[PDB]
Structures are given as C-alpha cells and as structure tokens.
Amino acid sequence: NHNLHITEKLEVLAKAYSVQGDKWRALGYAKAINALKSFHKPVTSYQEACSIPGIGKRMAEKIIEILESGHLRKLDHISESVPVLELFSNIWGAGTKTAQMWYQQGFRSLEDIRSQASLTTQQAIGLKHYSDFLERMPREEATEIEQTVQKAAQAFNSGLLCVACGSYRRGKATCGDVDVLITHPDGRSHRGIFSRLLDSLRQEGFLTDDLVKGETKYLGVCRLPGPGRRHRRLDIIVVPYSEFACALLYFTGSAHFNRSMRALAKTKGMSLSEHALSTAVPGRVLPTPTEKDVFRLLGLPYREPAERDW
DNA sequence: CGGCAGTACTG
DNA sequence: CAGTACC
DNA sequence: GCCG
Ligand SMILES: [Mg+2]
Ligand code: NA
Ligand code: NA
Ligand code: NA
Numbered sequence: 001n002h003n004l005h006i007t008e009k010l011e012v013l014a015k016a017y018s019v020q021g022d023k024w025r026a027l028g029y030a031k032a033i034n035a036l037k038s039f040h041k042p043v044t045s046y047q048e049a050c051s052i053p054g055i056g057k058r059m060a061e062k063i064i065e066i067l068e069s070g071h072l073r074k075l076d077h078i079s080e081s082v083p084v085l086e087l088f089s090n091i092w093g094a095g096t097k098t099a100q101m102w103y104q105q106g107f108r109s110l111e112d113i114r115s116q117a118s119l120t121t122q123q124a125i126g127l128k129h130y131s132d133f134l135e136r137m138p139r140e141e142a143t144e145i146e147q148t149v150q151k152a153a154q155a156f157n158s159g160l161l162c163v164a165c166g167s168y169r170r171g172k173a174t175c176g177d178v179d180v181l182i183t184h185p186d187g188r189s190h191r192g193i194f195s196r197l198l199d200s201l202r203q204e205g206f207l208t209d210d211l212v213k214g215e216t217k218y219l220g221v222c223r224l225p226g227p228g229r230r231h232r233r234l235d236i237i238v239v240p241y242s243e244f245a246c247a248l249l250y251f252t253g254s255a256h257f258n259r260s261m262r263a264l265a266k267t268k269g270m271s272l273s274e275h276a277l278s279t280a281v282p283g284r285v286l287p288t289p290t291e292k293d294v295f296r297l298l299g300l301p302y303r304e305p306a307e308r309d310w
Numbered sequence: 311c312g313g314c315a316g317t318a319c320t321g
Numbered sequence: 322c323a324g325t326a327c328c
Numbered sequence: 329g330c331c332g
Contacts, residue, residue, distance in 0.1 A: 017329085027314065028329025056330050093320095095325050120320080122325085166328075179327080212319055212326080219319090219326075235327070253328040262315055273316055274328075 001037040006063050009072050010036070016078045019085040021096035032059050034256065034310070043067075084108050092126030092133055092211065092233075125209045129221060132231040136174035143168075144224055145178045145234060152200040153182060157189050161244075165251040171306040177233035179251050183244045190238050194218060197236070207234075243275045245288045250274035256310040264298055272298075 001007060014029035035054035036043070043049050044067070049060035065072050081103050087110065088099035102117055113119070113127060126133060146164035153160045163169070166179040184190040198218060201207045208231055209221035218236040223229050239247040250258060251274065258272075265272040271280040277294050278285050288294045295302045 014329095022329090024314070025329045031314095031330070054330065058329065093325070097324060122320080177327095214319055217318060217327080237327085250328055255328045258328055259315080266313095266315095271315085275317085 002042045003036045003039065005070075006043065006066050007033050007036050009066055009075065010059075010062070012075055012078070013072075015086065016082045019082055019089050019096060019099065020079070021100070028054075028059075030256075036063075088113065090134060091123050091130065093120055093122030094126065098123075122211050125211060125221065129209070129231050133233060135230060136176050137178075137230070137232055139168055139173055139175055141224070141232070142175040142178045145222060145232060146180055148204075148206055148222070148224070149180045149182075149197075149201065149234075149236060152204075153193070153197055155200070156193060156196050157184065159186065159189060160184050160193070163248065165248060166253060167309070169248075169252045169305045170254065170309045172309065177235065179235045179237065181244075181247055181251055182236065182238045183241050183247075185241050187241045190240060193238065194236075239275075242287075242289075245290050245294060246272070246276050247274050249291050249294055252305050252308065254308055254310045257308040260310065261298070264300065268298065270298070 010029055010033050014026050014033060017023075017029065018026035031054040035052045039052055043052070043063055046060050046064050049055050049063045050057075055063070062072060062074070084103055084107075085096070085099045088094055088102050088107075089096060091113070094102075102113065105117075107113055107117060110127065110130065119127065142164060146162065146168070150162040153162050160182055161184065162180055162182050164178050164180055166175060166177065168175045168178065182190065182193075194213075194215075198207065198213075201222070205225070206222050207220055208223050210218070211221070212219035216238055220234055221231050222234045223231050237247065237251065249261075262272050265277065266280075269280060270286075271278045271283060272294070276285040277288050277297055286297055288297065292302050
C-alpha cells in the first residue's frame with residue numbers, strides 16, 4: 001500500500017458514515033480505499049486520482065487536500081457521537097438504527113447498555129461476548145471447530161459433506177468466525193438434520209449460545225474444551241447439493257469479490273446468489289456442479305479461494 | 311436519476 | 322413489516 | 329461516495 005497517508009484518513013470517514021447509517025456513501029469510500037491500496041504507486045495528481053476506478057471528483061479533491069497540508073479538514077467535523085455509535089453497533093444484533101436510538105436516549109457506554117437498555121435475546125448474547133466477538137481466532141482453531149461440527153454431522157450420516165468457508169477457506173492465518181457449509185450428494189439427506197446435529201453439539205457443551213435457529217441457517221456461539229479458550233462465532237448452513245457450488249462461492253467470499261461477481265453477472269444478463277447463477281430480465285437457473293462452472297459461465301478464468309481475498 | 315444483492319431470521 | 326446479519 |  002503506497003498510499004496509507006491517504007487510506008487511514010479515508011477509513012475514519014468511511015467508518016463514520018457507516019455507523020451513522022449512510023451505507024451507500026460508506027460503500028463508495030470503502031471501494032476507493034481498496035482502489036487506493038492496490039494501485040502500484042503513490043498518487044501524485046488530481047488527474048492521477050481520477051484515473052483510478054472508484055475515485056471520482058469529490059474523492060479526488062480529498063486526496064488533493066491530504067497530498068498538500070498533510071491532513072483532511074472534514075475529519076475535524078465528525079460528530080462526537082461516532083465513537084459511541086461504533087461501540088454500540090459492535091454488539092452483535094445491534095445495527096445503526098439501534099445504536100442511534102440508544103444514543104438519542106442518552107446512553108454512552110456499555111455499562112449504560114447493560115444497566116438500562118432493553119436488549120433483544122440476540123443483543124444480550126452479543127453484549128455478553130463483546131470482547132470475544134471482536135477477536136479473530138488462529139486458523140488452527142477454526143480447523144478444530146470445523147472438525148468438531150464434521151464429526152458430529154458424519155456420526156448421523158457419514159455421507160454428509162462439511163466445509164469451512166470464509167477467510168478460512170481463503171487461506172488466511174486468522175478468522176473472525178467459522179462458516180460451516182453442509183450438503184449431501186444424495187440431494188435429500190441434508191434435510192432436517194439440525195434437530196440431531198445441534199442437539200449433539202449442545203450435549204458436548206460445545207454450543208454455548210444460539211443467535212439464529214432457522215430451517216436452513218444456524219448462527220451461534222461455541223467454545224472448545226480446555227483452559228484458555230474463547231467463545232467463537234459459528235455459522236452452520238445446510239444446502240441442497242445442486243446449490244453447493246454457488247454456496248461455496250458465496251460463503252467463501254470475500255464480500256467485495258462477491259460484489260464484483262454480481263456486477264459482472266449483471267453485465268451479462270445473469271444473476272448470481274448464494275443459491276444459483278441464473279438468467280434475469282422468473283429466470284432460468286443454470287447448472288453449476290462446481291465453482292469452476294460459475295466462472296466459466298461468466299466468461300471468467302477460475303480463481304482459487306486464496307485469490308478471492310478482496 | 312438511481313443502482314450499488316438477495317435471502318433468512320426475529321419479533 | 323423494519324432491522325440485522327451472512328459473504 | 330462512484331458510475332452509467
Ligand atoms: Mg466467516
Ligand atoms: Na475514476
Ligand atoms: Na452489530
Ligand atoms: Na459467519
């Protein structure tokens with residue numbers, strides 16, 4: 001990154017817009033931050049700034065300011081509420097609307113939230129694990145969590161396939177959470193296993209809290225046995241076999257890679273979701289038995305998971 | 311002017 | 322439904 | 329915020 005003198009300044013703004021709920025502006029900043037950090041040289045001119053996709057007039061100007069006086073005026077006018085809104089929206093289950101409401105009601109600290117705020121069941125769990133959910137785990141711990149789910153699943157049916165995706169599948173050294181995708185080639189046995197599987201992982205003591213307990217998605221909290229262990233976020237998603245390749249791709253990400261893939265699909269009159277690659281104007285699901293087929297049908301060369309970490 | 315993703319949950 | 326979350 |  002030859003532009004952290006620009007990037008770290010823009011990240012303050014990006015985050016301020018995000019926690020205040022201006023998600024589109026915050027998206028624009030994030031896309032420019034990525035662009036800025038991947039270019040091969042320091043940006044030196046306004047017309048050089050305009051040259052990179054994702055940097056437009058207003059963002060060009062903002063680099064011009066940093067380029068010179070070494071600072072950005074806008075940064076000194078960010079609402080004093082931003083750090084508190086960030087604090088609050090880092091509670092799992094509380095987003096920008098809840099953070100702003102708590103702020104308006106006068107709360108300023110997690111002690112205020114603990115003592116005075118009305119919390120949903122999910123937010124109480126997020127508050128209880130506030131520090132734990134901000135930490136990343138070493139990838140060897142993600143492996144242990146994956147293999148815990150897999151052995152519990154394969155005990156029920158040995159043909160169940162279980163794959164940790166997210167940053168773990170992209171080869172990263174640490175992971176914020178473990179996303180375990182499960183399917184079955186028979187196209188049928190995947191159905192209605194949560195009953196047994198979640199009971200099994202609960203029996204262990206492995207599952208400590210449930211955030212979402214749905215027909216096809218589980219989101220919750222686990223902890224491995226022994227001393228010195230943290231609570232970790234764990235998602236388990238069960239998918240029909242025919243959707244496995246698109247699910248793998250989506251839940252492997254990264255989020256910005258998926259975003260680029262959806263736009264490319266749109267340019268070709270298709271749609272790409274976690275369930276399928278389709279035509280669009282319902283639409284025709286195209287057959288994608290493997291991740292390679294998704295790339296091929298988009299006219300793209302295959303990228304293994306590790307070079308999707310955008 | 312307006313999309314920038316579409317679901318799956320929760321209550 | 323609005324809000325939040327998944328990548 | 330960017331871009332078409
Ligand atoms: Mg993940
Ligand atoms: Na540009
Ligand atoms: Na949150
Ligand atoms: Na996850």
